[PDB]
Amino acid sequence: LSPLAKEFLDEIERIQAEVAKNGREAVAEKYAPKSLEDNEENREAAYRFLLVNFPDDFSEEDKKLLEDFFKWFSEHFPEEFLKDLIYDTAFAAYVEAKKQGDPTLVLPITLYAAFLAFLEEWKKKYPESLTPELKELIEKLKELLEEAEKNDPRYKQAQAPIAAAKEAAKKQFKKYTS
Ligand code: NA
């Protein structure tokens, strides 16, 4: 695991322990961005605010998929670009959810959808560089989002935050490959 990959799953568990003690409403309020200004502090806060909502329906298969994505990303890009991708997509989702009037729409699916969008841009740019590893990541992310569309009551309500995260992912991809 890259240093950023371990921090990710560990921070989820650290926050999950806070929720067990203090309740999710209090913990979400603790980690919510202080404003909508696009600065490093608020982007990092949006990332932690997203993590508050991660343990709910967080399977070992979902964890392994995240690990596989992190490994692939780190093989192709500097580590700092992964942090920026996660923070920028979490912030975009949060800002849009807040505008819609429900910050609880900052759901894990927003991050999975952003990772899928990033991979789809990579596939478009490097059509002669596809590998079984990439093809499997794309397939598994599509299947995860297909299962959420079928079984998560909030999928439709989260359309706008998901779209904002996907657009942020596309913008980061264009930055990382120019
Ligand atoms: Na699942």
Numbering used by the authors: 2 to 179
Text of the article:
Unique membrane topologies, such as those from G-protein-coupled receptors, are not found in the soluble proteome, and we demonstrate that their structural features can be recapitulated in solution. Biophysical analyses demonstrate the high thermal stability of the designs, and experimental structures show remarkable design accuracy.
Next, we attempted to design a larger fold and a more intricate topology, the rhomboid protease fold (RPF). We selected 15 designs for protein expression, of which 13 were found to be soluble and five were selected for further experimental characterization. In the case of the rhomboid protease design RPF_9, we observed high accuracy between the X-ray structure and the design model, with r.m.s.d.Cα of 0.97 Å and r.m.s.d.fa of 1.83 Å. Specifically, large structural deviations in the first extracellular loop were observed, which could have been due to its native positioning in the water–membrane interface.
